[PDB]
């Protein structure tokens, strides 16, 4: 079971809304090279390699964890799309 | 644009003809040696489209620099072969005939 699923499901008015928020954030992180993360270095999910701990390649995990943090804001009609896109590309170039 | 709807209606002979890229005159498939589409046959490239990407039948225009250009000699447009899945043919009947769906589907609409 994905950790804190009860909490995430408690956050929203529909489970599917959660799914969308998560997937969108995952694509955001994948697009900006994770640089936009609200996670502190100790809050970073880790993959255990042959060598040692590395970052977690799965953006969805990251997204759900970030969503757990309560540092993300979700909703409809918060910002025009293009403006958001270019603000993110300005803050975090790819 | 975004597709919000799908309509299905009856097709006029004028509509049908306006779809068609040519009328197939002959009941011929392919040449029994060269294995190529017969002229005014069911597979004819003059109508439906080129067999090879951006290449005519005779081979006069082989490149993308010619697009929309119809070869004069073999009468084949130079374009993507994929259109052979798309472009419609047609057959003009001497005497008109009845679409059987509007005949034998009870109760008969025509009837």
């Amino acid at each position: 079971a994905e950790p804190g699923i009860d909490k995430l499901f408690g956050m929203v008015d529909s489970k599917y809304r959660l799914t969308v928020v998560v997937a969108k954030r995952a694509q955001q992180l994948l697009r900006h090279g994770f640089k936009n993360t609200v996670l502190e270095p100790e809050e970073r999910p880790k993959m255990q390699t042959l060598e040692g701990l590395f970052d977690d390649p799965n953006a969805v995990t990251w997204a759900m964890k970030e969503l757990l943090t309560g540092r993300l804001v979700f909703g409809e009609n918060l910002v025009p799309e293009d403006r958001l896109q270019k603000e993110m590309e300005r803050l975090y170039p790819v | 644009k975004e597709v919000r709807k799908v309509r299905i209606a009856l097709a006029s002979p004028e509509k049908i003809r306006s779809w068609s890229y040519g009328e197939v005159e002959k009941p011929e498939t392919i040449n029994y040696r060269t294995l190529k589409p017969e002229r005014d046959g069911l597979f004819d490239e003059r109508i439906f489209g080129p067999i090879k990407d951006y290449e005519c039948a005779c081979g006069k225009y082989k490149r993308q620099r010619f697009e929309g250009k119809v070869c004069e000699r073999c009468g084949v447009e130079v374009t993507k072969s994929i259109v052979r899945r798309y472009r419609m043919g047609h057959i003009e009947l001497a005497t008109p005939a009845a679409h059987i769906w509007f005949v034998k589907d009870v109760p008969s609409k025509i009837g």
Partner: protein, 99 residues
């Protein structure tokens, strides 16, 4: 011939995604190699192999396009081919595409 009724029959015309990706990566890598040259010699190679308008020009036409003699443009083609050979022997990137 016999009736299709056919589901055991593959489609041999259309490219598989593998082939598509292969051609894509080949074009990209070729642009990488041609970027390591000067724009004129790269353009000469492109016009000689037909990467620009789709067809291969003769020496007189490339020479008339850049404004030089056929011998000159042929020699430019040669030195470009040579530099590409050197960069190929060095990097060995394109080898895989020779099948």
């Amino acid at each position: 011939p016999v009736s299709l009724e056919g589901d055991f029959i593959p489609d041999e015309h259309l490219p598989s995604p593998v082939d598509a990706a292969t051609q894509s990566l080949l074009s990209e890598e070729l642009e990488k190699a041609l970027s390591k040259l000067s724009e004129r010699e790269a353009m000469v190679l492109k016009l000689r192999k037909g990467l620009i308008d789709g067809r291969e020009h003769t020496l007189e036409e490339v020479g008339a396009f850049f404004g030089v003699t056929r011998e000159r443009i042929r020699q430019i083609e040669n030195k470009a081919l040579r530099k590409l050979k050197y960069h190929e022997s060095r990097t060995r990137k394109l080898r895989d595409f020779l099948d």
